[PDB]
Amino acid sequence: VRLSQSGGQMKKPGESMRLSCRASGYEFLNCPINWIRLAPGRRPEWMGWLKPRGGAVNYARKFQGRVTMTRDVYSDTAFLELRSLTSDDTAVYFCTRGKYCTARDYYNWDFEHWGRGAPVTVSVLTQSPATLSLSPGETAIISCRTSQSGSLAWYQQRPGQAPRLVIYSGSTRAAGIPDRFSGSRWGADYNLSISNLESGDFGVYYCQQYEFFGQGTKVQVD
Amino acid sequence: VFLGFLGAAGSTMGAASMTLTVQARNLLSGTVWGIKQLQARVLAVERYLRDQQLLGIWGCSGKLICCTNVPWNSSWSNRNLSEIWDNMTWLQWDKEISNYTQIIYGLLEESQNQQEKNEQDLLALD
Amino acid sequence: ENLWVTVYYGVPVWKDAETTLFCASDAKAYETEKHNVWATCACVPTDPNPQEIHLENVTEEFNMWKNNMVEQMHTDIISLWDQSLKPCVKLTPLCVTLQCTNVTNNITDDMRGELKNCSFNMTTELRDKKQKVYSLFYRLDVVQINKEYRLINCNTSAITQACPKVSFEPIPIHYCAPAGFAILKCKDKKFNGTGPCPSVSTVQCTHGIKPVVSTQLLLNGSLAEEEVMIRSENITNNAKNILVQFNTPVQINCTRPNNNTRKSIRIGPGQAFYATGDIIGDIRQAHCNVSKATWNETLGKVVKQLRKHFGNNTIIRFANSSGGDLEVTTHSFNCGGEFFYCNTSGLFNSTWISNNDSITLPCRIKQIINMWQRIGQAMYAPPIQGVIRCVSNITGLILTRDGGANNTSTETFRPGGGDMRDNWRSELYKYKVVKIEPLGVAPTRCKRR
Amino acid sequence: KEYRLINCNTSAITQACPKVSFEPIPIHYCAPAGFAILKCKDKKFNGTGPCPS
Amino acid sequence: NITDDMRGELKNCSFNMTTELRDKKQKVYSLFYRLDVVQIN
Numbered sequence: 001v002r003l004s005q006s007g008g009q010m011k012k013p014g015e016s017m018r019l020s021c022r023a024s025g026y027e028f029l030n031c032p033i034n035w036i037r038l039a040p041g042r043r044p045e046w047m048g049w050l051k052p053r054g055g056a057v058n059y060a061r062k063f064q065g066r067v068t069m070t071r072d073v074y075s076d077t078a079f080l081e082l083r084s085l086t087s088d089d090t091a092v093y094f095c096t097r098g099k100y101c102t103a104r105d106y107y108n109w110d111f112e113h114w115g116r117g118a119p120v121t122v123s124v125l126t127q128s129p130a131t132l133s134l135s136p137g138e139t140a141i142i143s144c145r146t147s148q149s150g151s152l153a154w155y156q157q158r159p160g161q162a163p164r165l166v167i168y169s170g171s172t173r174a175a176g177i178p179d180r181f182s183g184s185r186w187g188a189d190y191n192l193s194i195s196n197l198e199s200g201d202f203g204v205y206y207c208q209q210y211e212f213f214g215q216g217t218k219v220q221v222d
Numbered sequence: 223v224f225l226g227f228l229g230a231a232g233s234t235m236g237a238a239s240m241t242l243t244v245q246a247r248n249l250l251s252g253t254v255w256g257i258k259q260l261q262a263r264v265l266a267v268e269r270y271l272r273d274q275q276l277l278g279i280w281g282c283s284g285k286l287i288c289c290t291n292v293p294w295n296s297s298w299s300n301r302n303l304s305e306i307w308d309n310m311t312w313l314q315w316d317k318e319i320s321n322y323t324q325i326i327y328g329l330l331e332e333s334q335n336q337q338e339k340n341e342q343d344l345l346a347l348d
Numbered sequence: 349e350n351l352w353v354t355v356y357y358g359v360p361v362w363k364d365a366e367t368t369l370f371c372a373s374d375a376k377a378y379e380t381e382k383h384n385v386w387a388t389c390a391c392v393p394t395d396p397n398p399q400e401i402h403l404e405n406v407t408e409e410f411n412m413w414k415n416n417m418v419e420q421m422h423t424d425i426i427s428l429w430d431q432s433l434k435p436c437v438k439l440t441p442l443c444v445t446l447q448c449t450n451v452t453n454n455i456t457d458d459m460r461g462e463l464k465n466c467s468f469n470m471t472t473e474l475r476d477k478k479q480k481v482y483s484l485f486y487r488l489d490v491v492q493i494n495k496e497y498r499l500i501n502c503n504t505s506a507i508t509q510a511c512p513k514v515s516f517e518p519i520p521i522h523y524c525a526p527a528g529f530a531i532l533k534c535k536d537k538k539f540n541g542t543g544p545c546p547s548v549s550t551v552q553c554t555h556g557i558k559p560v561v562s563t564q565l566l567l568n569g570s571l572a573e574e575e576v577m578i579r580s581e582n583i584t585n586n587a588k589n590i591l592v593q594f595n596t597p598v599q600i601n602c603t604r605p606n607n608n609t610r611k612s613i614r615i616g617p618g619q620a621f622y623a624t625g626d627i628i629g630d631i632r633q634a635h636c637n638v639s640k641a642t643w644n645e646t647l648g649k650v651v652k653q654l655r656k657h658f659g660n661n662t663i664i665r666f667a668n669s670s671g672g673d674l675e676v677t678t679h680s681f682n683c684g685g686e687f688f689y690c691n692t693s694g695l696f697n698s699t700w701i702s703n704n705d706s707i708t709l710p711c712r713i714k715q716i717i718n719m720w721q722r723i724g725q726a727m728y729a730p731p732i733q734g735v736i737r738c739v740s741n742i743t744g745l746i747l748t749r750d751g752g753a754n755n756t757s758t759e760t761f762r763p764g765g766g767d768m769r770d771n772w773r774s775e776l777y778k779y780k781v782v783k784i785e786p787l788g789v790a791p792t793r794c795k796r797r
Numbered sequence: 798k799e800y801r802l803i804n805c806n807t808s809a810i811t812q813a814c815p816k817v818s819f820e821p822i823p824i825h826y827c828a829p830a831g832f833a834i835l836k837c838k839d840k841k842f843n844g845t846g847p848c849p850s
Numbered sequence: 851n852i853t854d855d856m857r858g859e860l861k862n863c864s865f866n867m868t869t870e871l872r873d874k875k876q877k878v879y880s881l882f883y884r885l886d887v888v889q890i891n
């Protein structure tokens with residue numbers, strides 16, 4: 001499964017922008033594609049999803065009337081348009097696909113596949129701690145408090161790379177995730193524990209419940 | 223009383239032992255799209271003869287019920303006579319004994335009618 | 349005192365499994381003949397006196413979202429569609445240049461034609477002289493190319509014309525299980541379709557389920573008991589569809605005010621194409637009526653059930669589809685052989701707070717379809733003579749909820765669909781397949797010498 | 798004078814393969830286990846009703 | 851670019867083709883191996 005995105009761009013206020021994302025390696029019609037924007041030091045915002053089967057779509061409230069999502073089933077390419085761009089829209093826009101995606105059913109919100117992202121410049125879930133300075137070998141314990149409950153996920157973003165799904169269902173590791181990563185739960189509280197820190201582990205981590213994301217925790221080497 | 227097919231499923235094993243002749247009766251029941259039912263009723267009769275073969279090689283042959291000369295091992299969920307037939311359903315019992323069904327089957331087909339019938343072969347010649 | 353094993357054959361013991369289900373469709377439906385309509389050809393006649401055994405004291409867990417009968421029915425209808433279209437006339441030499449023009453009518457400029465009067469060449473019975481014949485196609489069926497047009501499916505797949513002998517009329521089909529299996533049925537009045545069921549009964553064959561292929565609006569379905577039912581695999585998940593089942597059916601009337609002519613142009617030898625001749629009468633467009641009062645009471649009864657899951661004092665707003673293909677943005681269905689796509693913007697345009705005529709909807713008609721998101725097989729629906737009128741029951745909806753809310757207490761719902769498996773899940777929620785294991789061993793004080 | 802095949806605007810046409818033959822060969826029809834075929838062996842059976850032998 | 855001992859092997863063939871429509875043809879070219887083609891006079 002590979003999501004190939006078009007590059008980033010610089011727009012002016014008032015203009016409109018259009019992005020594409022070509023999926024490959026699986027049956028495009030099986031499960032929806034999502035569009036999520038990440039602004040530096042800002043809570044990631046889920047914009048909407050599209051079911052390629054019939055082109056069904058679902059837009060976030062904030063974007064209703066401004067965003068238009070379509071797709072080309074023949075070229076397996078998803079298109080998005082955003083009108084009336086304002087400075088608030090500066091962010092890196094990603095197309096995502098969930099992990100579980102078979103013919104029988106799917107689960108949209110475990111985003112295991114991410115595009116490279118498109119930087120566009122125009123000119124609840126309580127996650128703690130904000131930052132975490134630790135040495136290689138120690139253990140990092142990131143916490144996320146919910147209020148709704150439901151399959152929670154943990155993602156890792158390395159400096160300059162697309163986020164990678166690390167954990168889903170609060171306690172289940174994804175493909176390629178070693179035993180060092182582990183999840184736990186107590187009531188509304190969720191804990192991600194990373195033992196024996198190493199260079200690759202450092203970055204920023206996010207907790208997620210459906211379309212809502214945490215504020216993020218930057219784990220850096222000291 | 224006749225609860226019907228699968229009637230006493232939630233009843234105790236002692237109570238469900240009265241409905242044996244009901245689930246046994248409806249177990250056999252007498253261009254494409256027409257082979258869909260053919261291959262199904264063929265697997266149906268293969269499942270029937272499979273169970274009849276197991277029921278035959280053991281010390282039963284006569285269906286429904288039969289006794290055997292096998293001591294009940296306490297490791298196979300050590301329960302009491304009145305705690306099985308009057309406090310447990312057949313689904314709940316099979317859920318516990320699922321580990322030892324194949325072992326008992328081996329102690330039934332081999333240890334019995336292979337040594338018992340040969341013993342009769344020695345007892346019937348005199 | 350020491351117990352002894354005893355083999356019991358015929359015990360009420362079943363386990364969840366998947367098997368090969370066969371069909372059943374009464375005995376009067378076979379008298380419908382007409383060269384095998386839909387499927388009923390070699391289907392087993394339904395038992396005149398079906399038996400439904402209520403399993404007392406039995407509580408069995410169902411799961412409409414992990415049920416294999418839906419996948420089996422889906423693949424069965426797909427194979428049905430292929431077997432029904434294999435021996436029909438293939439329209440391979442029909443992608444010829446179409447010199448189309450407006451239909452004979454009188455303005456305005458907002459009528460946007462819709463109907464195109466195309467003239468073109470055609471191969472006759474002999475392989476020499478051609479044939480300059482004309483037909484009448486819908487705009488959704490043609491596409492211009494640089495007035496010259498072409499069929500919209502030229503660079504997609506092949507095309508085969510549906511035979512006029514068969515029909516697409518959904519007839520009740522009973523799914524039955526072979527010997528050794530059984531179908532469990534939940535008979536509680538409030539089974540919202542997942543988990544343990546208090547009153548479980550066993551059956552050999554399910555009730556007559558008509559395979560009505562439709563989107564957004566569930567037509568000719570089973571009515572719910574007491575209160576209208578709301579079913580979802582994950583309510584907090586806005587990506588999972590929400591199947592709504594009605595208690596009182598909503599009367600809908602759809603008509604095709606364009607009583608048409610069938611021209612039987614001959615693409616011999618043997619094959620024959622059924623084009624659309626001239627229209628006798630007025631140039632009118634198909635439309636659907638929904639009784640305003642019935643729609644109000646149904647919506648007001650549904651929003652009261654929606655407030656039981658998204659908070660008591662919340663605002664529920666209805667909006668129509670956000671966009672995509674015609675099969676998802678419109679109410680797609682079949683009536684009289686024609687494939688309608690109706691505008692459902694007059695039904696989902698409301699805003700409900702915590703506390704006398706008909707609604708007409710513009711319906712389009714398409715002849716070249718590719719349902720079930722199938723590529724490789726395009727079917728040309730032959731024209732149907734006479735005014736087509738049909739009265740159906742709206743018995744349920746397929747809704748989707750908007751996401752990324754966080755802020756605000758209102759929730760917005762839009763019509764969805766696409767996956768035709770959801771259309772089958774609205775009828776197979778109360779059934780599940782189990783396999784019988786009659787061999788059960790149990791200890792008792794019985795032996796021989 | 799221009800002609801054509803008489804079956805052009807009727808159906809398709811396939812040529813019979815020269816390998817096979819249309820020679821009527823005796824075919825015995827038999828019944829599976831559990832069934833039987835009754836045969837009337839009277840010299841004057843005009844073919845309907847009870848048969849003596 | 852040569853020599854004469856390279857014996858081509860690869861042939862750059864141009865030809866007609868039937869398009870989607872049963873009217874205008876299609877002047878397209880392909881590249882076939884010598885074992886796949888054979889000249890005719």
Ligand SMILES: *[C@@H]1O[C@H](CO)[C@@H](O[C@@H]2O[C@H](CO)[C@@H](O[C@@H]3O[C@H](CO[C@H]4O[C@H](CO[C@H]5O[C@H](CO)[C@@H](O)[C@H](O)[C@@H]5O)[C@@H](O)[C@H](O[C@H]5O[C@H](CO)[C@@H](O)[C@H](O)[C@@H]5O)[C@@H]4O)[C@@H](O)[C@H](O[C@H]4O[C@H](CO)[C@@H](O)[C@H](O)[C@@H]4O)[C@@H]3O)[C@H](O)[C@H]2NC(C)=O)[C@H](O)[C@H]1NC(C)=O
Pocket residue numbers: 149185186187188540541542543578579580581
């Ligand atoms: C169809 O309709 C039916 C109704 O007939 C319906 O069934 C009920 O559905 C409703 C939802 O509308 C249920 O109500 C909710 O159930 C939630 C799930 O509860 C389970 O999970 C709890 C969490 O377990 C994790 O956490 C603990 C502790 O950390 C952990 O140890 C476990 O390992 C697990 O990982 C679990 O505690 C809970 O157990 C309690 O509850 C059952 C009764 O539900 C009780 O018998 C036990 O003894 C135990 O006391 C259960 O196993 C639940 O999360 C949710 O909220 C509760 O929990 C949050 C947690 O903070 C609370 O804050 C909140 O106030 C709630 O108390 C809520 O209770 C209900 O569970 C269903 N009933 C059944 C029988 O399943 C369907 O949903 C309907 N379907 C559709 C499609 O509409």
Ligand SMILES: *[C@@H]1O[C@H](CO)[C@@H](O[C@@H]2O[C@H](CO)[C@@H](O[C@@H]3O[C@H](CO[C@H]4O[C@H](CO)[C@@H](O)[C@H](O)[C@@H]4O)[C@@H](O)[C@H](O[C@H]4O[C@H](CO)[C@@H](O)[C@H](O)[C@@H]4O[C@H]4O[C@H](CO)[C@@H](O)[C@H](O)[C@@H]4O)[C@@H]3O)[C@H](O)[C@H]2NC(C)=O)[C@H](O)[C@H]1NC(C)=O
Pocket residue numbers: 382515517518558560567568682683684737738739740741
């Ligand atoms: C949801 O459930 C409802 C409930 O049934 C269902 O409504 C049914 O709608 C269909 C239309 O789609 C109906 O079937 C057609 O009805 C018309 C009109 O009926 C009149 O005629 C009879 C004659 O006795 C009267 O008793 C009756 O009261 C009406 O006055 C019929 O004319 C149709 O007959 C032809 O069509 C069939 C299928 O095409 C053929 O199989 C049949 O043989 C007929 O064909 C012949 O006659 C044609 C007449 O011109 C001729 O042109 C043909 O070439 C051919 O020679 C047809 O029976 C039905 O009546 C409705 N049900 C009820 C109870 O009235 C919905 O359709 C359903 N929704 C979905 C999505 O399935």
Ligand SMILES: *[C@@H]1O[C@H](CO)[C@@H](O[C@@H]2O[C@H](CO)[C@@H](O[C@@H]3O[C@H](CO[C@H]4O[C@H](CO)[C@@H](O)[C@H](O)[C@@H]4O)[C@@H](O)[C@H](O[C@H]4O[C@H](CO)[C@@H](O)[C@H](O)[C@@H]4O)[C@@H]3O)[C@H](O)[C@H]2NC(C)=O)[C@H](O)[C@H]1NC(C)=O
Pocket residue numbers: 450451452465466467480481482626627
């Ligand atoms: C869809 O579009 C197609 C064309 O693409 C249409 O089909 C054509 O319709 C026109 C009508 O507008 C037809 O024209 C008529 O042809 C008749 C055929 O007569 C033949 O034989 C006589 C000798 O008896 C010859 O003289 C003649 O040339 C033909 O060879 C004519 O008889 C008609 O003439 C009558 O009507 C005109 C109308 O002005 C009068 O002036 C005349 O005096 C006379 O009364 C007429 O010319 C045409 O033939 C059709 N073509 C085909 C291929 O069918 C559809 O009309 C159009 N549909 C819609 C809804 O727009």
Ligand SMILES: *[C@@H]1O[C@H](CO)[C@@H](O[C@@H]2O[C@H](CO)[C@@H](O[C@@H]3O[C@H](CO[C@H]4O[C@H](CO)[C@@H](O)[C@H](O)[C@@H]4O)[C@@H](O)[C@H](O[C@H]4O[C@H](CO)[C@@H](O)[C@H](O)[C@@H]4O)[C@@H]3O)[C@H](O)[C@H]2NC(C)=O)[C@H](O)[C@H]1NC(C)=O
Pocket residue numbers: 607608609628629734735
């Ligand atoms: C929808 O569009 C279709 C288009 O085909 C219309 O169908 C035609 O309708 C007309 C009008 O009813 C029919 O014309 C009728 O013809 C009858 C005789 O037909 C027979 O005989 C001829 C030879 O003379 C044969 O060729 C033919 O095959 C038949 O065997 C006349 O007797 C009719 O007149 C009587 O009825 C009318 C009302 O219809 C009265 O006003 C008259 O006074 C008289 O009592 C009539 O002229 C034509 O046959 C139909 N064609 C077909 C193929 O069915 C539909 O009418 C139209 N429907 C609507 C609602 O718009």
Ligand SMILES: *[C@@H]1O[C@H](CO)[C@@H](O[C@@H]2O[C@H](CO)[C@@H](O[C@@H]3O[C@H](CO[C@H]4O[C@H](CO)[C@@H](O)[C@H](O)[C@@H]4O)[C@@H](O)[C@H](O)[C@@H]3O)[C@H](O)[C@H]2NC(C)=O)[C@H](O)[C@H]1NC(C)=O
Pocket residue numbers: 072073074075491493500501502503504
């Ligand atoms: C063959 O049938 C196909 C149907 O299955 C047709 O494919 C679709 O055709 C429509 C238009 O008829 C396209 O919709 C348009 O898409 C463009 C996209 O613009 C971008 O891409 C073009 C091409 O690379 C580029 O030049 C532009 O600058 C853009 O970068 C939109 O701009 C339009 O508004 C309109 O939505 C579909 O995209 C297309 N589908 C696919 C999968 O390509 C096809 O046209 C038919 N071909 C012929 C010859 O008739």
Ligand SMILES: *[C@@H]1O[C@H](CO)[C@@H](O[C@@H]2O[C@H](CO)[C@@H](O[C@@H]3O[C@H](CO)[C@@H](O)[C@H](O)[C@@H]3O)[C@H](O)[C@H]2NC(C)=O)[C@H](O)[C@H]1NC(C)=O
Pocket residue numbers: 454455456
């Ligand atoms: C046949 O075609 C004619 C010509 O278009 C049709 O007449 C048109 O009818 C419309 C509708 O009444 C007119 O639009 C009008 O525009 C004025 C602009 O101010 C507006 O005030 C009116 O309320 C109306 O919307 C249009 O002007 C008129 N065109 C002409 C040339 O008269 C006619 O209706 C068609 N049918 C028949 C049977 O004639």
Ligand SMILES: *[C@@H]1O[C@H](CO)[C@@H](O[C@@H]2O[C@H](CO)[C@@H](O)[C@H](O)[C@H]2NC(C)=O)[C@H](O)[C@H]1NC(C)=O
Pocket residue numbers: 599600601637638639706739
């Ligand atoms: C669909 O059409 C039927 C038939 O015309 C309508 O039923 C009629 O309703 C009126 C008003 O209540 C009655 O006077 C008639 O007696 C009814 N006729 C029949 C045959 O039932 C029905 O109301 C229409 N529904 C919609 C939504 O248009």
Ligand SMILES: *[C@@H]1O[C@H](CO)[C@@H](O)[C@H](O)[C@H]1NC(C)=O
Pocket residue numbers: 148149150151581582583584
């Ligand atoms: C969603 O459905 C799954 C499957 O039953 C269940 O495990 C999960 O708890 C559900 N999520 C919520 C938030 O109820």
Ligand SMILES: *[C@@H]1O[C@H](CO)[C@@H](O)[C@H](O)[C@H]1NC(C)=O
Pocket residue numbers: 295296297298
């Ligand atoms: C019975 O089970 C026990 C413990 O599992 C074991 O020691 C013994 O060998 C078993 N005997 C038989 C006859 O199965």
Ligand SMILES: *[C@@H]1O[C@H](CO)[C@@H](O)[C@H](O)[C@H]1NC(C)=O
Pocket residue numbers: 296300301302303304349
């Ligand atoms: C009950 O089970 C125990 C433990 O195996 C045993 O000592 C006792 O004999 C059993 N009693 C009866 C009545 O079966």
Ligand SMILES: *[C@@H]1O[C@H](CO)[C@@H](O)[C@H](O)[C@H]1NC(C)=O
Pocket residue numbers: 317318319320321
């Ligand atoms: C089944 O056997 C496994 C493996 O020894 C064991 O973990 C489990 O407890 C057994 N279950 C029962 C019901 O005996």
Ligand SMILES: *[C@@H]1O[C@H](CO)[C@@H](O)[C@H](O)[C@H]1NC(C)=O
Pocket residue numbers: 449450459460461462
């Ligand atoms: C109909 O005629 C008008 C006037 O020439 C033209 O603009 C239009 O494209 C034609 N077709 C349709 C569908 O309106």
Ligand SMILES: *[C@@H]1O[C@H](CO)[C@@H](O)[C@H](O)[C@H]1NC(C)=O
Pocket residue numbers: 468469478479480
């Ligand atoms: C077919 O279309 C062509 C368009 O070039 C036209 O010349 C011809 O008259 C039409 N009719 C026939 C029978 O060829």
Ligand SMILES: *[C@@H]1O[C@H](CO)[C@@H](O)[C@H](O)[C@H]1NC(C)=O
Pocket residue numbers: 644645648
């Ligand atoms: C719809 O019914 C509701 C509830 O009875 C209501 O408040 C409203 O006025 C009705 N709408 C119309 C148009 O009658």
Ligand SMILES: *[C@@H]1O[C@H](CO)[C@@H](O)[C@H](O)[C@H]1NC(C)=O
Pocket residue numbers: 668669670671676677678691692693
């Ligand atoms: C919804 O209504 C709008 C008009 O407000 C229309 O543009 C759009 O096509 C409609 N969508 C559907 C799915 O009916």
Ligand SMILES: *[C@@H]1O[C@H](CO)[C@@H](O)[C@H](O)[C@H]1NC(C)=O
Pocket residue numbers: 691692693
């Ligand atoms: C559906 O109807 C609404 C209301 O009339 C209209 O605004 C919209 O454009 C229509 N949609 C289509 C696709 O025609």
